[PDB]
């Protein structure tokens, strides 16, 4: 789903070397796109809840 | 560490001296708890249990009545746990 | 016997007390409380009242009977090494050792041979002394002690000699 | 020092010595079996030509001892 | 090529006391120490292919 | 070689750009152990291969083909049946190891892809499903233990189903 | 080295279509770990000594020092070597900062 | 088997009959021990002692088979239902599974395509 | 090649002097057993006939090698016994083993059914004389009569079975000629034709019903423990079930269905009794019922996978149960009673024999692939193709397979031995050699078990 920013995490892993723990810039990208994707999934559930209230009035 | 025959008698006498119920001057080693020392019928079971806690814990129910004297109890505990060679 | 049944229960009650309490100072507090409970009935001798208390002694004790009691180290039954740590070797296997290997360390073999010769000679005298005891059936409860001082060895010789060493 | 628990031992240790002495006696052809692969060639995969079907060994691959 | 060769070394090192168990050479009191020394070098030979796996 | 398909070629090339460090632990150990005892093992193998010199060619594979099939000769007679029964048992023993090669082709696919597993390959998956289904119908797999005389009845059972179904449609 | 093994499962378990009763039962067990771990310290190690036997010898041996001290490297650096080097698949930490993420750490404290 | 309260020290009285009852138990206990004492404590033996009680224990299962069973009654027939009975129990289990399988081979195939072993 | 040097063992024992005997009988037998492996193993696609029909080739029988393996081993453990009695009596009961070896070779080699039958029942005669004599305990006759009146009562129906086939359908003879055989039409008249061929092999291969033939033969010991190995050979001596079911009745398996169900209950109930039993020899005697019951299940399925497990278990059990009886004999020669509870003490008194006790016990269970993992597991895998329910019953049996072995271990692994004063020497050089000659051939089968299971393998 993320695709673009998720591929950047593998780029840091490709040239990782000894002491591979020091990679924060690529790890932050995975926490940005997936959080927006989870919010988009939450927005779809909120839209269904709002539609049920309008349908009950008619 | 191995246990000595002279050391085991001194260890048993040290625990009996700090018992508070029995006098340190009246009884030493040769004097029996049954007649010489002022000990109750229920008191002998409590004194034998405390002696087992310090050394190797082994006390039979049938052999509890036979052991009363501190000199006899020190020999019975050493023989059962295999001591002095 | 009435005296033995009280002592057997009192010995169990003290060792079962340290399972409930954690600290040794709290153990001594409850130990004095148990003494006051039994001394009230110990003052007078009874045939009906004391026997009623003996069956009553099983109650209360059985209500708190299983908190997994402590047997401490190597104890008859219980937990944590009852027959373990001591594998041991029988005395019959000692004489079974073949030559060449038996030649190594001759101090242990020669001393054991002297004790074996003494045990063989005393066996004939011990057999007559065992049947000399007045019963005229076979035996009564426990084995009888030696009367003779010159011959020595009270009935059994291999009972105490050569057992087990940890 | 103690006399300790005694076993038979003499009959027991002798059997293991008598067993291994006859393993070692026929342990020589085991040592030759390694050198048979080392010195002599085992087998090579090759297509057969129409001349002879079987000679000494008919069809055997791997180990000279098989042939 | 080194990955395949070094992998079997860890398997062979643990079987070497079993190969020397059946008499072979006499070892008094040194046999408990022989197990310690066999596994000590077995750890170093197993560390390299795991480092290869990260790469 | 030849019979076994497998992958064409593997890439495998290291770049090493990020971090200086001590070059690489994997690369340094590979170069060191190649000359330590791997070079000595290659020299000892070459010394024994050259020491052979003279070698026998040998026939290896035997011929013997057809010699009349079992579904051509009938009636209980030892003179005709024995040659036919040996032919069917020859085919059955080979077909047990034919499947093994095709099975090993599927074994080779699983390791080489790993993450892909069932997403790719497809050729080895289709080849295995075609042979095993044919092996189940023709070479017993349902009609008890191996017998050449019972095999003709097994072939007749499959032929009877083909004649009955096609006639209706 | 607890967060690098135990806490990653708890955070991942909350975001699923799976059974609710199974999820609630695991949360009690994560807080239950603190009881028996302290029952080694507070019950036996900590406080006044119970005194098991009169004159008991306890000393550190040369073989003991070389074993325990070198085990400390494995028990501390496990969340540095194993967790970082191994390539993962799909990140679980995203939703619920107080309900799912904090609940794994708060259970050990409570 | 266990009751409401575990039997260990429950219900005990001194009396007169119970005092002689323990005397009867020790009379046999000491008698059988002394004959063991005379056999164990001598170097002249070398061997395994017989003991008539242990031989009769092995004889209880290895023998005394056909001297018994002469009163069959209804207890023997109940044991037959627990023996020959369960053999007839699986007859309506294995056949029903086989009839389920045999119908699938002829019509509506259920067997896997990647099956070749046996 | 096989017969004739075996017959020459008879004048060997009689002509040799009284001081020797045992040296000549054991050494000469070992070199004949080496030559059996030298020639018999060679086979093509279908195993071609040896010579004229007197003794023929092996098609799916590596079990002949096992008979050659026990050919010297049936003399090693019998050394402790027979030595007290007359020199003429010693020579007689070595030659009865030679006669057993003579007839046992003839059964597995000769590819027949007509002449095989008069070798099948011919093994019963030397064993009868062996069992009825030298028995230390009583009821020799309450086991000796039961030895024949179980077997001969079931095997005499082969005379009305086998002859009936050759009178109608060509001739039985070579078996390589036996392709004249047409499938049975399955009728009420054809019921007793199938039963008569089976009931003969239903006795020698013990089930749940008519199984009491085996424990009576084992508990009441013939001579020491070496003759009990020949009683193991009689179980696998009924191997013709591999040949009859495949050739004579291929279509008939509907009537096999109740007999599988009988043998399936001869797995739980036969194992349950093998737990609380007193005799050490009896706890091998009832475990041998269930282990050979696995083979009977495999035969009646008729799947190609099951015969692989069937042929493996014949060799697997033939060298594991015989190994267990030698351990039972080693305690019987020292304690002089077959009681498990009384004879208690391993490692402390028997230091090196206890490791042989462990290796023999664990082989009954599924160890790393020796022979029993290739034996037992192959049958369990084949039973699922028959029916899905089987492993629910067969899995319970896999729990109690430990309960034969470990219960035999634990009840001897207590280092008390207070009553016992005997067993000074742990084991003689021959006694430890017996234990090695049973397990080490199975340990060599780990590398190549092709000569352990081969019906079209």
CB contact under 8 A, G43 and C72: no
Q: How far apart are CA H57 and CA I239, in angstroms?
A: 39
Q: How far apart are CA B55 and CA B77, in angstroms?
A: 9
Asked if G87 has any chain C CB less than 8 Å from its own CB, the reply is: no
Q: Where are the beta strands (DSSP E) in C9-118?
A: none
Q: Are I180 and F76 in contact (CB under 8 A)?
A: yes
Using DSSP's 3-state secondary structure scheme, residue I339 falls into strand
Q: What are phi and psi of C45, to 5 degrees?
A: -95, 125
CATH superfamily of B7-81: ACP-like (1.10.1200.10)
Return all residues near E34 (Cβ < 8 A) that are at least 6 apart: E17, E20, E27
C89: distance to nearest CA of chain I, Å? 6
* CA distance readout (Å), C92 to C61, C110, C154, H40, I425: 47, 16, 21, 12, 10
**Which chain F residues touch H if contact means CB-CB below 8 Å?**
99, 128-129, 132-133, 135-136, 141-142
State both tokens at F142: 């349902």
F30: distance to nearest CA of chain A, Å? 17
Asked if D15 has any chain C CB less than 8 Å from its own CB, the reply is: no
Angle (nearest 5°) at CA C132 between C126 and C134 = 140
Q: Are I54 and I110 in contact (CB under 8 A)?
A: yes
Q: How far apart are CA I212 and CA H65, in angstroms?
A: 13
**DSSP letter (8 states) at residue C126:** H
Return all residues near B71 (Cβ < 8 A) that are at least 6 apart: B9, B29, B30
What is the residue whose two structure tokens read 């004492």?
H37
The residues spanned by each domain of chain B are 7-81
What is the residue whose two structure tokens read 């002859």?
I163
Q: How far apart are CA G76 and CA G69, in angstroms?
A: 11
Nearest to C94 by CA among C165, C166, C162: C162
Q: Are I359 and I439 in contact (CB under 8 A)?
A: yes
Q: Report the residue of chain A nearest F25, measured CA to CA.
A: A18
Q: Are C85 and C74 in contact (CB under 8 A)?
A: yes
Set of chain B residues whose Cβ sits within 8 Å of the Cβ of G53: 53-56
What is the residue whose two structure tokens read 């234990």?
I435
Q: Are I58 and I40 in contact (CB under 8 A)?
A: yes
**DSSP letter (8 states) at residue I279:** B
Whether residue B61 lies in the annotated active site: no
Q: What is the dihedral of CA C98, C99, C102, C107, to 10 degrees?
A: 140
Q: CA H104, H108, H109, H110 torsion: positive or negative? A: negative
**C64-76 burial, b for 16+ CB within 10 Å, e for fewer?**
eeeeeeeebebee
* CA distance readout (Å), F131 to C63, F98, F148, H108: 73, 9, 20, 21
Q: Report the residue of chain G nearest A32, measured CA to CA.
A: G94
Q: How far apart are CA I456 and CA F101, in angstroms?
A: 19
Report how many helices (DSSP H) and strands (DSSP E) chain E contains, helices first: 2, 0
CB contact under 8 A, B11 and G57: no
Q: What is the CA radius of gyration of chain B?
A: 12
B58: distance to nearest CA of chain C, Å? 6
* CA distance readout (Å), C153 to C145, C157, E12, H45, I449: 9, 6, 61, 19, 65
Helices (H), I387-428: 390-400, 402-410
* CA distance readout (Å), E42 to A23, E7, E46, F26, I213: 32, 10, 6, 17, 56
Using DSSP's 3-state secondary structure scheme, residue D57 falls into strand
State both tokens at I54: 């007197």
Asked if H64 has any chain C CB less than 8 Å from its own CB, the reply is: no
Residue B10 half-sphere exposure toward CB, CA atoms < 13 A? 6
Query: Of residues B40, B53, B61, B82, which has the active-site annotation?
Result: B40
Nearest to F17 among A15, A18, A19 (CB): A15
Tell me how crowded residue G56 is: count the other CB atoms within 10 A of its CB: 10
Q: Chain F 102-141, CB below 8 Å of chain A: which residues?
A: none
CB contact under 8 A, F136 and H116: yes
Using DSSP's 3-state secondary structure scheme, residue I14 falls into helix
Give DSSP secondary structure letters for H5-29: S--SS-S---SSHHHHHHHHHHHHH
Q: Are I174 and I53 in contact (CB under 8 A)?
A: yes
Return all residues near G90 (Cβ < 8 A) that are at least 6 apart: none
Asked if H30 has any chain C CB less than 8 Å from its own CB, the reply is: yes
Q: How far apart are CA C77 and CA F112, in angstroms?
A: 60
Q: Where are the beta strands (DSSP E) in I318-416?
A: none
* CA distance readout (Å), I274 to I277, I327, I403: 6, 17, 8
Set of chain D residues whose Cβ sits within 8 Å of the Cβ of C163: none
């Amino acid at each position: 789903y993320c695709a673009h920013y998720l591929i950047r995490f593998l780029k840091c892993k490709r040239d990782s070397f000894p002491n591979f723990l020091a990679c924060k810039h690529e790890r932050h990208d995975w926490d940005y796109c997936e959080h927006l994707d989870y919010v988009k999934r939450m927005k779809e559930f909120e839209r269904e809840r709002r539609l049920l209230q309008r349908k009950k009035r008619r | 560490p191995p246990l000595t025959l002279e050391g085991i008698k001194d260890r048993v006498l040290y625990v009996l001296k700090l018992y508070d119920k029995i006098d340190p001057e009246k009884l030493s080693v040769n004097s029996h708890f049954m007649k010489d020392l002022g000990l109750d019928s229920l008191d002998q079971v409590e004194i034998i249990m405390a002696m087992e806690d310090e050394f190797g814990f082994e006390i039979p129910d049938i052999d509890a009545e036979k052991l009363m004297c501190p000199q006899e109890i020190v020999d019975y505990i050493a023989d059962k746990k295999d001591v002095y060679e | 016997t009435h005296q033995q049944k009280v002592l057997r229960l009192y010995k169990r009650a003290l060792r079962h007390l340290e399972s409930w309490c954690i600290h040794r100072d709290k153990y001594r507090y409850f130990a004095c409380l148990l003494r006051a409970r039994f001394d009230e009935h110990k003052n007078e001798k009874d045939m009906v009242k004391a026997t009623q208390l003996l069956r009553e002694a099983e109650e209360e004790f059985w209500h708190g009977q299983h908190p997994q009691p402590y047997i401490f180290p190597e104890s008859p039954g219980g937990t944590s090494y009852e027959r373990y740590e001591c594998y041991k070797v029988p005395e019959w296997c000692l004489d079974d050792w073949h030559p060449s290997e038996k030649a190594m360390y001759p101090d242990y073999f020669a001393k054991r041979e002297q004790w074996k010769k003494l045990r063989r000679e005393s066996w004939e005298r011990e057999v007559x002394x065992x049947x000399x005891x007045x019963x005229x059936x076979x035996x009564x409860x426990x084995x009888x002690x030696x009367x003779x001082x010159x011959x020595x060895x009270x009935x059994x010789x291999x009972x105490x000699x050569x057992x087990x060493x940890x | 020092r103690l006399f300790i628990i005694k076993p038979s031992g003499f009959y027991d240790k002798r059997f293991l010595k008598l067993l291994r002495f006859y393993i070692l006696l026929t342990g020589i052809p085991v040592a030759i079996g390694i050198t048979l692969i080392n010195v002599x060639x085992x087998x090579x995969x090759x297509x057969x030509x129409x001349x002879x079907x079987x000679x000494x060994x008919x069809x055997x691959x791997x180990x000279x001892x098989x042939x | 090529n080194m990955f395949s060769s070094l992998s079997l070394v860890t398997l062979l090192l643990l079987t070497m006391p079993i190969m020397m168990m059946s008499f072979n050479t006499y070892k008094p009191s040194n046999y408990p120490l022989y197990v310690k020394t066999a596994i000590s070098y077995a750890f170093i030979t197993s560390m390299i292919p795991t480092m290869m796996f990260i790469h | 070689x030849x019979x076994x398909x497998x992958x064409x070629x593997x890439x495998x090339x290291x770049x090493x750009x990020x971090x200086x460090x001590x070059x690489x632990x994997x690369x340094x150990x590979x170069x060191x152990x190649x000359x330590x005892x791997x070079x000595x093992x290659x020299x000892x193998x070459x010394x024994x291969x050259x020491x052979x010199x003279x070698x026998x060619x040998x026939x290896x594979x035997x011929x013997x083909x057809x010699x009349x099939x079992x579904x051509x000769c009938q009636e209980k007679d030892v003179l005709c049946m024995f040659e036919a029964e040996m032919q069917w048992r020859r085919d059955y023993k080979v077909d047990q190891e034919i499947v093994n090669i095709i099975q090993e082709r599927l074994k080779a696919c699983q390791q080489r892809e790993g993450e892909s597993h069932r997403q790719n390959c497809a050729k080895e998956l289709e080849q295995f499903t075609q042979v095993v289904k044919a092996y189940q119908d023709r070479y017993x797999x349902x009609x008890x233990x191996x017998x050449x005389x019972x095999x003709x009845x097994x072939x007749x059972x499959x032929x009877x189903x083909x004649x009955x179904x096609x006639x209706x449609x | 080295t607890g967060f690098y093994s135990k806490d990653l499962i708890i955070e991942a378990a909350n975001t699923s279509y799976t059974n609710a009763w199974a999820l609630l039962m695991t949360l009690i067990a994560t807080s239950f770990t603190a009881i028996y771990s302290t029952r080694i310290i507070f019950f036996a190690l900590l406080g006044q000594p119970r005194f098991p036997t009169l004159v008991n010898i306890n000393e550190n041996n040369p073989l003991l020092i070389n074993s325990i001290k070198r085990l400390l490297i494995g028990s501390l650096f496990a969340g540095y070597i194993i967790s970082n080097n191994i390539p993962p698949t799909t990140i679980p930490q995203m939703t619920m900062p107080y309900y799912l993420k904090t609940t794994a750490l708060i259970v050990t404290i409570l | 088997x266990x009751x409401x309260x575990x039997x260990x020290x429950x219900x005990x009285x001194x009396x007169x009959x119970x005092x002689x009852x323990q005397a009867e138990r020790l009379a046999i206990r000491s008698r059988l021990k002394r004959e063991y004492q005379l056999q164990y404590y001598d170097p002249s033996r070398r061997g395994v002692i017989e003991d008539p009680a242990l031989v009769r224990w092995t004889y209880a299962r290895s023998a005394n088979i056909y001297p018994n069973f002469r009163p069959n009654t209804k207890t023997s027939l109940l044991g037959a239902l627990f023996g020959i009975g369960p053999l007839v129990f699986w007859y309506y289990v294995f056949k029903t599974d086989r009839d389920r399988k045999e119908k699938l081979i002829q019509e509506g195939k259920l067997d896997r395509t990647f099956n070749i072993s046996y | 090649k096989y017969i004739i040097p075996t017959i020459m063992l008879m004048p060997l024992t009689w002509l040799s002097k009284n001081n020797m005997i045992w040296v000549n009988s054991t050494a000469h037998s070992l070199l004949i057993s080496f030559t059996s492996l030298l020639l018999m193993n060679q086979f093509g696609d279908n195993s071609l006939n040896f010579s004229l029909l007197f003794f023929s080739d092996s098609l799916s029988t590596p079990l002949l090698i096992l008979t050659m393996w026990l050919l010297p081993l049936m003399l090693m453990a019998s050394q402790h016994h027979l030595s007290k009695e007359n020199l003429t009596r010693k020579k007689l009961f070595i030659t009865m083993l030679i006669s057993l070896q003579l007839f046992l070779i003839m059964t597995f080699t000769a590819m027949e059914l007509i002449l095989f039958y008069i070798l099948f029942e011919a093994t019963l005669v030397p064993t009868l004389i062996i069992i009825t004599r030298w028995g230390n305990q009583t009821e020799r006759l309450n086991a000796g009569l039961y030895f024949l009146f179980y077997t001969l009562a079931g095997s005499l129906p082969l005379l009305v079975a086998l002859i009936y086939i050759q009178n109608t359908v060509g001739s039985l003879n070579f078996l390589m000629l036996q392709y004249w055989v047409q499938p049975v039409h399955n009728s009420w008249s054809n019921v007793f034709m199938w039963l008569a061929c089976m009931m003969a092999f239903m006795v020698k291969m013990p089930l749940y019903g008519l199984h009491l033939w085996l424990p009576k033969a084992h508990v009441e010991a013939p001579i020491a423990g070496s003759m009990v190995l020949a009683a193991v050979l009689l179980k696998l001596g009924g191997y013709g079930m591999l040949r009859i079911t495949l050739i004579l009745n291929p279509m008939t398996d509907f009537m096999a269905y109740p007999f599988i169900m009988l043998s399936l209950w001869g797995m739980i109930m036969t194992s349950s009794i093998c737990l609380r039993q007193t005799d050490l020899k009896s706890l091998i005697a009832y475990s041998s019922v269930s282990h050979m019951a696995l083979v009977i299940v495999a035969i009646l399925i008729q799947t190609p996978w099951s015969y692989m497990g069937a042929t493996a278990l014949m060799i697997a059990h033939g060298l594991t149960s015989s190994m267990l009886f030698c351990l039972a004999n080693s305690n019987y020669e020292r304690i002089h009673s077959r009681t498990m509870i009384l004879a208690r003490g391993l490692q402390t008194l028997l230091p090196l024999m206890a490791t042989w006790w462990l290796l023999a016990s664990l082989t009954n269970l599924a160890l790393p692939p020796t022979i029993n993992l290739i034996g037992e597991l192959f049958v369990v895998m084949s039973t699922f193709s028959w029916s899905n329910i089987t492993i629910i019953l067969m899995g319970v049996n896999m729990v109690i397979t430990a309960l034969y072995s470990l219960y035999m271990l634990i009840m001897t692994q207590r280092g008390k031995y207070t009553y016992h004063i005997n067993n000074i020497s742990p084991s003689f050089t021959r006694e430890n050699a017996l234990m090695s000659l049973h397990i080490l051939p199975l340990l060599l089968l780990t590398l190549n078990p092709k000569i352990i299971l081969g019906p079209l393998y």
